[PDB]
Structures are given as C-alpha cells and as structure tokens.
Design a protein around this nucleic acid. Structure first.
Lengths: 59, 114, 148, 52
RNA sequence: AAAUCCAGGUACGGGUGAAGACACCCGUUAGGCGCAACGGGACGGAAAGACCCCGUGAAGCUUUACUGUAGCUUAAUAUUG
RNA sequence: UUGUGGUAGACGAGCGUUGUAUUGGAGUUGAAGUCAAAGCGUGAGCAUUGGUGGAUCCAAUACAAGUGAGAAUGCCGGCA
RNA sequence: AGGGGUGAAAUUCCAAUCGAAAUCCGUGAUAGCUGGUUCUCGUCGAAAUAGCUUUAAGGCUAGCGUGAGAUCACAAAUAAG
RNA sequence: GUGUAGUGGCGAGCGAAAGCGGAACAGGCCAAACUUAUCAUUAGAUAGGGGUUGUAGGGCUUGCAAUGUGGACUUGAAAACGAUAGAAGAAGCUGUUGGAAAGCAGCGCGCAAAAGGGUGAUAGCCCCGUAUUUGAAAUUGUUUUCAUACCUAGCGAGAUCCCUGAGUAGCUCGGAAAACGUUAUUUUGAGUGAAUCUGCCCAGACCAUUGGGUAAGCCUAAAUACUAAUUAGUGACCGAUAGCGAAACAGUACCGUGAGGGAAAGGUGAAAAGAACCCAGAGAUGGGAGUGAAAUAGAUUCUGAAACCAUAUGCCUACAACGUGUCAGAGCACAUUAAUGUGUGAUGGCGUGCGUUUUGAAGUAUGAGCCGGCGAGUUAUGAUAGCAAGCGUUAGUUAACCAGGAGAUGGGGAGCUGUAGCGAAAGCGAGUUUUAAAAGAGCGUUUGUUUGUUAUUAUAGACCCGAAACGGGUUGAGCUAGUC
C-alpha cells in the first residue's frame, strides 16, 4: 500500500522501534505559557505503547 | 471444481427424520419440523432422567408409608428406628418389594425393637 | 519419500471461516461485530481515522526538510570491527570488486569507521577516515594513504 | 537419465507408459523418485558431483 | 378461483406473565363430526406506518445564506483610418 | 489432585464432498443414486443386507477448493 | 421533447405511471440503516463503563476475555495485628 | 529505482524523472545561399543539379583518391519451406459367465504407430485411425540466390565571402499536459513582437562563468496491445436451476407502438425389432398375445426418492382441556442387522415451538405454507505477527528476460533487507543532537536472510442482498394538453 505522506513528514524512525516526534504548543501564544513550559516542550519525544499499532502499519 | 453436494443433505435429513417416529400429524415427515420436535423430545428426556429418579423415590416413600401405617406407627419413626438405634442402611426399594414376599418385611419391622 | 506417504511436521494450521456453522466455534458473524459498524460490509474505516477526533498525524507539528529536494549523499561504509574477518590486505577499489564487497560498477566514496583494535597490518585506500579510527590503524603498524 | 542424448534409445520407448528418456537437466526431483527403478549413464556421475 | 399459513386434536372464570393468554398457575364447564347463520377475539388478512423521530439520507421550492454562473451592462484593446 | 454452565469471542483438535498425483482393490457373479431395515462412534458421520439399475467406483497418504443450508416478506420447479 | 413540451394554472397532462417520463449506460452508485451469513467437537471466557468526537443507533484509546512469553516472591490476594 | 524526490482545505489521496538491467535497433529526405532553362522574363512562379547541419555544417575557388558499402528499395529468372484436396501405413485365437465379450482365464503377436473414437459390457492385435514415410493440376504465402532501375562514400588548401527553417521565440493577460493544484519545461485564445556562429537555446526565479545541443521542415521497419475469423491442440473449467441469456429450427415464444426487456424444456431400447392379431369399448386406451435379455424399457419413453393423495395388514380413540412429546405403564398382534427385541400406547408424573433482534421471549413484535435444488469470507498486489523449512559469518537473495513440455529448473546479482547509528541539515561517528560543557538528557553500544503456511489489515465492489438517487445518450403527441 501507499504510505500516507501527510505522516511521513511528522515521524522519524529509530533503531528498535521508538518512533520519534516533536511536541506541539510551540508556534502560538507564548506568554500564556511559562518559560519553563517552553523549556520542557523544546525537547523531542516518543509515542506511548497505546498508539503504536495505528502508527506502525501506517508508516 | 464446482461442488454439487447432494448426499450430505439427504443423509442428514433422513437421519433426523428417522429419530422422530410415531409422531402426530406431519411432524414425522417434515425435516424442518422433525428436528425441532426431536430437540424438544430430547430436552424432555434430559429433564425426565432426573424427574423419574425423584418420582420413583416419592412412590417409594408412599408405598412404605402405606404398609407402615397399618402397624400403628409412623414412617419417620421407622426411619428413626433404622438410623439411631439398630443401625440399618437397608435399601428402601428392598423393603418395599419385601411387601411382595409376604411377612418377610415384618421381620425387619419387629427387629427394630431391641 | 514416496508419493503415498508425504508428511509435514508443523505446517497446515487451522483455517478460520467467517460463514460456516451456527455452532462451529465461529458463528454467523465471526470476526466482525455483533451488528456494530465493523460487522457491516466494508467496515474497519481508514486506519488513520480516530472516530471524529482530530487525527494524531495532524495534531503533531511537521518536521523539517532542510535540504529541499535532494537525497542524502550515500556512502559505502567499512567498519573496522568487521574488516578483520574478511581475509584480504591492501584493501583498495581495484580489489573490493573481486571479493564482492561492493557492486562491480558503482562510483561512490568510501568511508572508514571503527574503534575496535586490529592486529594484522592493513593498507587502506579510502576518501575519509575518523580521527581515532586513523589513530587505531596507525597504532598497529598500519598505514592509510588518504586519497582525494 | 542420459547425458549424451542418444537417438537410438529415444527412437524406442515412446509407446510404453512405463519408460521415458530425459536429459540430466530435464529431470526434476519428483520424477527422479517416481521411477521406482533407475538406469543412469556412466557419464552423469561426474556432472552430478560437480553440481553436487 | 385468493389473500394467509411455525407445527396444531384449537374452551371459560380468577390470577400470572414483554404489563389485555386457546395452551402458564388454580378451579369451572364440555360425547366425535357436520350444516345454515352472526361477526366479538385470534392486538384478524391485505400496505418492511404515509404520522413522529433517527440517518452527517433523497427530491422540489425560496431569499438581502455561501460559491458560482447563463444572460444584461460598462471599460482597455484588435478589427482602425 | 484440581476442574469440565455458557452466548459475544479467542484458541486447539477432527469429519464429509469434488477433482488431481501416485501406490492396492471391486465391478453384467451387478457400481453409484435411491427405497426400507430392530446396526457402530463423543460428533460432523461410518457400515451391512434385500428390491429397484445396467456403468463406473472403493480403500491409505497428500494437494486445490464455485464446498457442507432453517429462515433473508427469498428465486426458480412442483405440490397441499 | 423531458434539468424540456404544453398548460382558460389543478403540481393537470406528456402513452393507465410526473414536485418532473420510459429506457440503456456510468452501475455490482453509496448506505454509521434492516435481514441472512450453511460441518462438528475439546478449554477459557465479558462489557453495556471513563475520555474524546458535525458525536449520541457510530467510531477511536483506556479497563474488561483470550493466545505466546517473562516475573515465582522483593509481585498479587486471603485470615490476623 | 520507489511508494523515493515531491505535490496536496499539506486531508482523503496522488506520483514521477534520472540511472541501472532487459525486448528489439538503422537513420534518412526537403527550403537556403550557388547555378541552369522558361514564364506580357518586371514572376515573387515552373522545372532541373546541391546540401542535410554541431566532433558546427553547407554553398564558393581550387586538388587528390573512389567505381564501392547498402538498405524504409522497381522488377524479371529461378530454389527451398509451408498453406488450401488425399495415399501407404503392425500385430489373435481358445474357453468362460453370459441377450450379446472386447471384460475374465491360457498360450501368443507389433509398435518411429499403447493419441482418440466406434463396434449388443472397460478391445493394442474387430474398424476408422494414429507416429513415420509420401502426394499438388491450380492458387497463394515466407524466405534464399542472380541479374536489373532510383537513391548513396573518403582526405586536403583559401577566406572578417555567402547561407543555416518569421507572427518564429520570448513578454504581458487567462488557461491547460506536466507527479505539481501553474514554476522554469511544453502548449495557446488576445495583444506585443530579435539576432545570424562575435549567434540562439538548455542545465525548475535570475545574472555571470562552465559545459551540452542546434527548435520554430518532412519521413520511417522491428521490439508493444488486441482475436469477432480459419487450423490443430490443451484444460486438477461446466454438465440441462450448471455452461455464453441460446445443448432442442433463441434473441426465437412472449411483453410492449418503440428505445428495449426478454423465456422454459436434452436421454426408450444394442438394433423399432415402434407392438401383426384377439377381447371390451365409438374411439382414445387397456388387458392379452408377439419382438425383445428385459415391455416396471411402450412411446408420458435413463436413474424415479419430497412435500402430496389414495388402498391395505396390526393396534388405538368417541368424558376429552391436548406445543400433542417425554419417563414409567397393563393389554393386544407379530418375531429381529438376537439385540435386557419390534409395532401400537388404554393409564399416571412432567411438560408455553424454532430462528432473528433484544434490559428482556410462547408471544397480543417479528421471519418462514411444505418440499427439492441454487443461494456469502475467496482472489490479485503489499504490510504486520506466530509456526515451520533452507542458507549463515562479508550472510541471504533473484525480478523482468533468454532456454523447454505452456514444467521445476538452468543462466540472468538490476536491485532488496542485514552489516552504525545519530542529527532538521551541513557532517560526525561507537558516538551522536542540545548546549560554553567532553555535565546531564533522548537514541545507539552488531544482532539475520529467502520462502511455505496461518490470522489481521491496506487498494481493488472485497461477506450477500436492499433504496429514494445523480449525470449522459436514445424512444415516444396514435393517450392527453395546445396549435395548424
């Protein structure tokens, strides 16, 4: 099947699974959030084991 | 390979119909009705295989009481005189048909008195 | 074997059927639903859909494409933890093609990588080497003639 | 099973359900064990060893 | 000749039960089977309720709801001095 | 010794039909189908026998399935 | 001559059918909405909840069953303090 | 290559171009300067040579050496191999059950022919045939050889000499093919409208450099798709509810005024040997006789079960509240797949169907009149996971394609995953991004590959059936409305 390109631009593969992603809440209304909030959300992240199946076969 | 599949239906319907023999109306000719009739018949057989082992025991007790009321004493008293004194695990259907052999049950009747 | 006693060991597993038997173990609605949406024809809507809630592949931000419309420059890697097993010296492009390490006709720079120690002296001819990899190569009396 | 593809042999054996002549490269795994009796050429041993 | 038809040898009162029982519970009544009538029931037969509601349904119609558009009209331009 | 109610459902173990591949067998001394019969298994099922019938089937192992009917106000065909 | 005709205007009629014919094709249109989904047997075995949802008769994730594997005791339950 | 680069209310989705490996393979022909002849020689037109362009070429002045390489190719002479009719073409009796032998049993025979069909049962030697060898008066196809007509050829020297595809290309205004939803590329409806090798264009805005190619002219075989037709053959394709709707005088019968919609049904028997004749009846017909192994094979014509409806042995019922069955049960008449046996069931106990949908069923909800047949989880391409198998320490692995029996397999390593990963990227590397940080944090610290099979899922209608619908194309004014 064709892999949806709308998602191939929002996920990155890593060795032994562990899909990589970026956190949201970074492009709007900075003053409403603390500087500590932006300090945390600047880092990358990974998805939980819950949505792993819906991402695996889709990518 | 196109499959016709004719033998299975005939043999199944014949086997189901043969089970319900001596049935009123068309219930012994229509397979669709015969299967339901045999379903219900076997369910009744299942429940009756316990209902009869209970009803026979009921008639068992009744016919013991019939004989024991003639001696002027109570059936429960007879079971008592079996159990606590003069310990006897004697069969009930035994003592029932020992009415048929005459006066031989009376030996057990007189034996409970120590 | 003979054509009358062919035998398997563990293949020929169970064959589920979605439309045979009321009480075969699999019912009339086997696998799909009990009159739910998935039970119906062409059920199991598209995998990315999540019920009406905004999809996960849209709630997340979008990654970057720093180099727009290009492919990453590919390299052929020679890790020093595996070259030692391959029995050959003077490892050079005139000699890789013989050992089937690389494709016969292929133009590509060669990268040298590794930290694990090596014993037998070697003579690499590559385009680039890691600094500590080069140090490790030169520790064991080896020599690397770094090409252009 | 024959390596030389002799014409004298192949002229015969064509009207019997039991016998047929084939080259080494032509026979498969199935037919080779369907025979119940084998008649092999002396030449085919070296080629069979070479192909293992 | 027809619609209907799960299989039927098809009772009534009180109650019970998916909430109004030919079959369930307890009592009552009643020989088997016709024929002529008479329509109370079998939520009777015939219409996958026309009504209400649901469906991310259909169609038609309407306007200063949206986006358009045939047509109408004005302007630059070629036909052009 | 502990257990064995059971739909939705997961999962394991099996039967049957058609055809093909081989290995054996039956068959105008009578196959299949089908009629009926007081058989044998836990089951889908599998036997035996008599009459009907005058040409194909059976047993063991595998493989491939237009494959196993009680309903869809069914549809064809016949009949109350 | 049909997203048209005609219409002393009623949504009349246009071959018994007309809020827009009959017929063929795209067409096996789609349908979160009915009903059906045919061989048997062995073991275990729910839910009708929370969140979200142009969602409320639906779907997704979590909990709930089940197949394979690990933890065997520091993990989990029962009685007591 | 690759579901890659990318394109998308960045959503459903969509999807290249290089390069690589294969199938096949070959390039030619016009205008232009130059020149000749003719056009009221004003021709601007007609007809001849000359050239087919980038390693820039051609024309001009002037030399050398060809006499030939060759086919998108004209005809004549022949040859081979087919095609449209045919021929030759091996081998047996005996007994047997039997209506009939060919099956079955005994001894034989041939195969470059044991494919197939028919012959009173399944025939190698009964028949046609079949493998092979042959045969064309006439027509026709492909290929081969020779002769022949047209078209074609190399290397020099001068020279700021001349020529090298005009509403052309860009530009602007709107579009469209491009994977792109308008961006170079391409194309054009409206306008604008150059140069001439010191040129022009191209390398996803553009300029410069660099390199590549010569548009605005024309032509082209094979390699690719398809099969209504003819020939031969094949089928783990169907067998009269199947197979194309059409095994039979099927697009017929029929439904319609017309577009169109559109049926059902085949089988005696080896051979009619299809029943002479008699009895009843008017006859159809039946019973006989007769043929035939069989007439229960009789024209209704292979096999003949179900709902259905009749007749009959044995038993039971007319005081009985009945989902009609079950467990005990006397009596009655029979004797079997010998089995604590069979049919019937006076009498007592118990006893509100089957499916679907449901908080919930006997339902005063539903689905079925019965019967027989048909009537739904597959298939193609990929992914995931289990199981199994082969290979394994520089592993493993073939796709298309060629070879043949339409076979596995042989060759074909083009690619694919694994071997190093991280980072948006430049890049670095057992480290890497963040940072001043080598501190910490995320990821990493070699841990397979190709298949068979199973389950789920992705695009295909993807379990089956069911709409009001939409759009496009046709036919209708003979009904009716209006008009003439």
């Amino acid at each position: 099947m064709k892999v949806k390109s709308a998602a191939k631009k929002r996920f990155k593969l890593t060795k032994s699974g562990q899909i990589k992603r970026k956190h949201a809440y970074t492009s709007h209304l900075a003053p409403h959030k603390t500087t500590k909030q932006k300090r945390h959300l600047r880092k990358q992240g990974t998805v939980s084991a819950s949505d792993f199946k819906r991402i695996g076969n889709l990518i | 390979m196109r499959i016709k599949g004719g033998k299975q239906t005939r043999v199944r319907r014949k086997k189901w119909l043969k089970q319900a023999s001596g049935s009123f109306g068309t219930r012994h000719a229509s397979y669709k009705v015969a299967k339901q009739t045999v379903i219900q018949a076997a369910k009744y057989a299942y429940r009756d295989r316990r209902n009869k082992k209970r009803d026979f025991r009921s008639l068992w007790i009744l016919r013991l009481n019939a004989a024991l009321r003639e001696q002027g004493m109570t059936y429960s008293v007879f079971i008592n005189l079996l159990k606590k004194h003069n310990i006897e695990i004697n069969r009930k259907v035994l003592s029932e048909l020992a009415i048929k052999e005459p006066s031989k049950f009376n030996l057990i009747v007189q034996k409970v008195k120590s | 074997l003979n054509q009358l006693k062919s035998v398997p060991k563990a293949r020929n597993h169970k064959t589920k059927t979605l439309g045979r038997g009321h009480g075969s173990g699999l019912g009339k609605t086997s696998g799909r639903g009990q009159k739910g949406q998935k039970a119906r024809k062409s059920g199991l809507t598209r995998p990315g859909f999540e019920g009406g809630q905004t999809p996960l592949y849209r709630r997340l931000p979008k990654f970057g494409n720093a180099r727009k419309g290009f492919l990453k420059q590919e390299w052929v890697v020679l890790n020093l933890n595996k070259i030692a097993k391959l029995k050959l010296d003077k490892i050079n492009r005139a000699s890789l093609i013989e050992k089937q390490v690389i494709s016969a006709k292929s133009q590509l720079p060669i990268k040298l990588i590794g930290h694990t120690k090596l014993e037998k002296p070697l003579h690499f001819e590559v385009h680039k080497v890691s600094k500590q990899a080069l140090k490790a190569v030169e520790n064991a009396n080896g020599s690397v003639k770094l090409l252009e | 099973v024959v390596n030389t593809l002799n014409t004298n042999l192949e002229q015969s054996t064509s009207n019997i359900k039991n016998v047929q002549v084939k080259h080494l490269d032509k026979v498969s795994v199935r037919d080779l064990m369907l025979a119940n009796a084998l008649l092999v050429e002396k030449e085919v041993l070296k080629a069979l060893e070479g192909k293992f």
